[PDB]
Swiss-Prot record, chain C:
It comes from Entamoeba histolytica (strain ATCC 30459 / HM-1:IMSS / ABRM). This is Large ribosomal subunit protein uL2. PROSITE patterns: RIBOSOMAL_L2. InterPro entries: NA-bd_OB-fold (IPR012340), Rib_uL2_dom2 (IPR014722), Ribosomal_uL2 (IPR002171), Ribosomal_uL2_arc_euk (IPR023672), Ribosomal_uL2_C (IPR022669), Ribosomal_uL2_CS (IPR022671), Ribosomal_uL2_dom3 (IPR014726), Ribosomal_uL2_RNA-bd_dom (IPR022666). Belongs to the universal ribosomal protein uL2 family. Residues 206-246 are annotated as: Disordered. Component of the large ribosomal subunit. The ribosome is a large ribonucleoprotein complex responsible for the synthesis of proteins in the cell. It comes from the Eukaryota. One of its GO terms (cellular component) is cytosolic large ribosomal subunit. HAMAP family: Ribosomal_uL2_A. The gene is RPL8. Keywords: Cytoplasm, Ribonucleoprotein, Ribosomal protein. GO terms for molecular function: RNA binding; structural constituent of ribosome. One of its GO terms (biological process) is cytoplasmic translation.
Length: 105, 73, 246, 90, 72, 50
RNA sequence: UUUCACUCAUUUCGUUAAAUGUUAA
RNA sequence: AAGGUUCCUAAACAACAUUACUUGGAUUAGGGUGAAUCGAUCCUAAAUUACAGAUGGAAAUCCUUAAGAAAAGGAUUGAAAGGGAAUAAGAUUAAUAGUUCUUAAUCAAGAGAAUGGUAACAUAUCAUGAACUUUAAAAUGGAGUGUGAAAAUCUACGGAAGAGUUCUCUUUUCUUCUUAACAAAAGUAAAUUCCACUGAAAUGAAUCAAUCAGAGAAGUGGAAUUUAUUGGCUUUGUAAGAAAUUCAAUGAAUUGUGGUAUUUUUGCAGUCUUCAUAAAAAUUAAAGGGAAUCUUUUGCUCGUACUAAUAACCGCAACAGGUCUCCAAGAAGCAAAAUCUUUAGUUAAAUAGAAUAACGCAGGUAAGGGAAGUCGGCAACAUAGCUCUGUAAGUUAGCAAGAAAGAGUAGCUCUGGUGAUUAUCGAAUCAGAACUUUAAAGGUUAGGGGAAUCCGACUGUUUAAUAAAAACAUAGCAUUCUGAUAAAUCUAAAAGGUUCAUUACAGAAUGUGAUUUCUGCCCAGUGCUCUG
RNA sequence: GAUUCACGCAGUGUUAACGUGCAAAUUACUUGUCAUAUUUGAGUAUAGGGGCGAAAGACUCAUCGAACUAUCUAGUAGCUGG
């Protein structure tokens, strides 16, 4: 069993000081600095995690392809497909009701 | 390092002017044509000697070609 | 002698409120024209737990009536409100639970909470969990109404003070018996440093006026005048009665 | 499993019989499920003191500290309803 | 354990060097110098500290520009 | 410490520089009484309080 | 001689000092 | 963190390290610390400090966005453990190395008005998108259970190379058989959430547990995300040319495939718990809206040596005291326990030799008796693991309880039970039977038991350095005042300050001390109060 | 805010060692405890008739029934020594 050491000058097991021990040539084990776990986007109404958008750090979406950070739909990337269907029905049905309620009832 | 998959991608790669150095490695089974470009080190694994020779014909004459074998340079 | 712990509390060094994870200030929106001559519609986005208080807080979202954008408020939840509900505030609001109305448009016998003692001051009375105030009478002569405070006291207010219809949520909070000293320790997570209270008689003569001698006792009456100086004001102040009631 | 100490058997024998009997009523009602006033499913569980969430129905309701609706908060909803009707008509 | 044992945890500085007097009297948490009275504009001098006055005052240093003026 | 400020390191370097002795030639001057530097210290003998 | 009525110093508050008051419409 | 040259080398030993020293953390003299990617620098947290204003005899205090012709909106500082653009492998030095060298990358700042799918959603930049507004990320407790994956250990098959044992055997025992950042996409997983078809009752589906369904289950076919970089695992480029193990005198050889085993790490899934609900900003992306019409250059400042402790730190010292973390093998066992070993480190860490007196300090044993010693079973002895049977009074009905008490346990040779795939393969676990012996937990580790009385209800805290308790706290009970311009209360004062981001289920001030039961009579005196 | 063992911690007993000590409070065995009223690092807040205290007049740099430091100060002594 090969025992390793911290490479950087951090000495405490904080969230940002996560390490992974991998093997290298000759039976030597080195230290890799592993990333933190992020959260994905959430629907602004129901707070459910959206599909089609990866769970990566906020600055990493700048490196993402322009089509890999949003879904091709009205309110894509901010609202679930169910969050949007009810939006359309609300917009249409209420406007229809306001046409028979007022405007020569 | 990137790996090209078929011949026509590396024929096109050589006839462009962006090549910087070519290293040929001969192994127990295959031959790798690691063309060094400005950004990446593209390589092609060929399994036929005749196809390997054709690649050496297409290599330009102003570019340096390094042959590597069971002994490191 | 020394300074008693009651004196040290007024300095506010380790007795400051532990208000770091608190949500904000729970109050009505500022009074304007649309709250005085019309109604505004608010949407209850969420109901949340505010540390250090027993009642939940509602994140209500009104549209900005004068500019383009939103206006995010933080109300005290009336018992019954749910997410996605619509609430209306203004002089013309309906008498439904959760709606904010001037105290003069509410009928006699109605129940309101988060009442304003002075118009536009965004809520003073009846804010704790389960508490409420009842409207007693109106006086159109000078536009004043009477309400009964949760302590049984009767108070007269201007008829245009706002109030939320209903009962503050979280009722019955104090009916569950605390059982462990640890549970009482956790009660003051978002409050002041006051919990483990040493009896004065167990102290020494320097520290407290009760600090006794060879037997733990007070030695002098524990009912004091209101005009006692700080430091010796310990026990019962201006007490008109004592003992057990029958 | 137990004769007459239902849920407060976790407290063992160290808080007084009466204090364990009193807390038993609250602790049963605090963890119990309630009928959701919108979707009518017994799927409402307490999140915090005074906050109740309908699990398979996507709603949050403000209620009592340990019960979804208190007695005091139940007669108020009817009392306001009666006054609202009287105010509208005459 | 008020004697030898409690001294082991002493590894946190209270004072560091001051910019105006050069002494290790700058209190890190009070943000003032115990010796020369930093950011306070006037130098910290007291009548009960007569030895402190004869340690740092006029004439205890180089007097780079006053030595010519008074000689003049 | 390993990490130090820029100015603090230079005041550490000067303390190293001043921990030297009298050069031999200076000791051969006529009427010389300076033989040893009495402002000398060692890391394990006296801490320099800085 | 307290007893009142107004505000004009004064007290206590609120906002982005964001429709107060009177007519008209 | 602290120390500050203690690091390395050479010369040299006067002093120092309770003998000595050729040794040294000691003397003398040189050498040594290399960053676009690690940190500080950047952001804000608890908190902190300025101009103008307010206060004060004064020094100075207050205020931190409220008072201001100040700052689209609120100033300064505050973290080398919180957030954050981007670097890895091999080699190299007497000493520096995610910093140098080789090779291979990454990031920032630049310079040169679209399709497809029913749908979930998908397309090497693509495929325009201003003001303004919103949403999300950064960014959020703990417990316990199940499980995916990697590494380590163990093990199965198949070999290659080297070493050990070998008069007694051993087809034997041991060592090596490796691979980075960043990217690719042959093959192929687990879990969750959605989409389409259809409509469940004779109710089904499913987990270790649960849990779910006509605001729609199961079935079939799909989409998406997570799984320590692209896309989790194998594989691939990197990349065998490196490195490891051998052989020869620079040059040659090999570098398969598995596991229904254990541990660690890392995620995931739902469950439980709270009168506790478990940070913010810098910064980024998307949406609503419709204003307008591959190559190359640069990447600045500062820290970087060494110890991190039975000798580099704090205790006067090379002081048995104290001081925050990361990586972590075999045996054995329930066990990260005691005990022994492997890789690594060290054999010196305030001097030895001889003799083997008394009195000592530390560890022991003992005939017969068995607390008769003593203030007192102080000290020591004694019980001790696991399995089966059995277990009282009392009781807040939960416990007492490992009550008390009794039996078994070793070695060797066997037998049966508990699964997976269609006979083979694997898991340590349980039960049983003969035979033998020194009759078996006890090398180490490892509860003495019972009957009562007093106090405190309990878990907890306490006189650092003679008192750990019956003392304090505690939940429970109760009393008092207060409508918030208040009550308590800090300040010399103050558009001053605390509880108060508060509002009677609250704030403030006290006594008693769980539960059960009960709190008797007295208002004359002293307090306090009154609507007199 | 169940019973225990372990890494740690404390300090019940020996009223053992030591007591011009390893140490101006330590050592050995024994005992208690060993995660939610827990343990702990750094930052930050509270200052002398003040603070802080689950309360011992405890703690506030080996200093506490009023810290340390300098000045008034060569304080005063019907008392003691020369």
């Amino acid at each position: 069993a090969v025992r390793v050491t911290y490479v950087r000058k951090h000495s405490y097991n904080t969230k940002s000081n996560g390490i992974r021990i991998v093997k290298t040539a000759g039976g030597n084990m080195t230290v890799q600095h592993r990333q933190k776990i992020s959260n994905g986007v959430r629907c602004g109404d129901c707070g459910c995690v959206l599909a089609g958008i990866r769970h990566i750090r906020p600055h990493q979406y700048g490196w993402l392809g322009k089509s890999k950070r949003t879904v091709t739909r009205a309110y894509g990337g901010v609202k679930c497909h169910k969050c949007v269907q009810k939006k359309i029905l609300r917009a249409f049905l209420i406007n229809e009701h306001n046409l028979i309620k007022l405007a020569a009832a | 390092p990137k790996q090209v998959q078929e011949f026509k991608q590396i024929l096109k790669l050589l006839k462009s002017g962006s090549i910087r150095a070519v290293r040929v490695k001969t192994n127990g089974e295959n031959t790798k044509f690691k063309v060094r470009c400005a950004k990446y080190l593209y390589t092609y694994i060929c399994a036929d000697k005749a196809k390997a020779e054709e690649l050496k014909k297409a290599i330009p004459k102003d570019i340096h070609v390094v042959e590597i074998a069971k002994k490191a340079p | 002698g020394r300074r008693t712990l009651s004196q040290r509390k007024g300095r506010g060094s380790i007795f400051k409120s532990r208000s770091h994870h608190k949500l904000g200030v729970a109050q009505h929106r500022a009074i304007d024209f649309f709250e005085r001559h019309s109604t505004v519609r608010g949407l209850v986005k969420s109901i949340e737990h505010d540390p250090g208080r027993g009642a939940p807080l509602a994140r209500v979202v009104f549209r900005n009536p004068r500019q383009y954008g939103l206006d995010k408020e933080l109300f005290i939840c009336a018992e019954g409100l749910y997410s996605g509900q619509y609430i209306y505030c203004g002089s013309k609001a309906s008498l439904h639970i959760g709606n904010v109305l001037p105290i003069g448009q509410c009928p006699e016998g109605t129940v309101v909470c988060n009442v304003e003692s002075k118009p536009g001051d965004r809520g003073i009375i009846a804010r704790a969990s389960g508490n409420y105030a009842t409207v007693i009478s109106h006086n159109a002569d000078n536009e004043t109404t009477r309400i009964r405070l949760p302590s049984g006291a009767k108070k007269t207010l201007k008829s245009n003070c706002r109030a939320m219809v209903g009962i503050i949520a979280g009722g019955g909070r104090t009916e569950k018996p605390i059982l462990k000293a640890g549970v009482a320790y956790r009660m003051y997570k978002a409050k002041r440093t006051t919990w483990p209270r040493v009896r004065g008689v167990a102290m020494n003569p320097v520290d407290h006026p009760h600090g006794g001698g060879n037997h733990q006792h007070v030695g002098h009456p524990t009912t004091l005048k209101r005009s006692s100086p700080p430091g010796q004001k310990a026990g019962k102040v201006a007490a008109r009665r004592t003992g057990l009631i029958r | 499993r137990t004769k007459k100490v239902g849920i407060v058997g976790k407290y063992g024998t160290r808080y007084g019989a009466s204090l364990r009997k009193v807390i038993k009523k609250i602790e049963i009602a605090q963890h119990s499920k309630y009928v959701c006033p919108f979707c009518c499913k017994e799927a409402v569980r307490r999140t915090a003191c005074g906050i109740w969430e309908c699990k398979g129905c996507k709603k949050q309701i403000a209620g009592g500290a340990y019960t979804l609706s208190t007695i005091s908060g139940a007669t108020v909803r009817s009392t306001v309803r009666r006054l609202r009707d009287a105010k509208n008509s005459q | 354990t008020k004697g030898t044992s409690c001294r082991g945890t002493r590894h946190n500085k209270t004072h560091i060097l001051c910019k105006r007097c050069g002494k290790r009297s700058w209190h890190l948490q009070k943000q003032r110098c115990a010796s020369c009275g930093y950011p306070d504009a006037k130098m910290r001098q007291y009548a009960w500290g007569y030895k402190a006055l004869r340690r740092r005052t006029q004439g205890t240093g180089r007097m780079r520009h006053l030595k010519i003026a008074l000689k003049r | 410490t390993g990490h130090k400020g820029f100015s603090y390191k230079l005041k550490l370097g000067k303390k190293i520089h001043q921990n030297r002795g009298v050069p031999q030639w200076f000791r051969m001057k006529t009427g010389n009484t300076i033989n040893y530097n009495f402002k000398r210290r060692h890391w394990n003998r006296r801490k320099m309080g800085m």
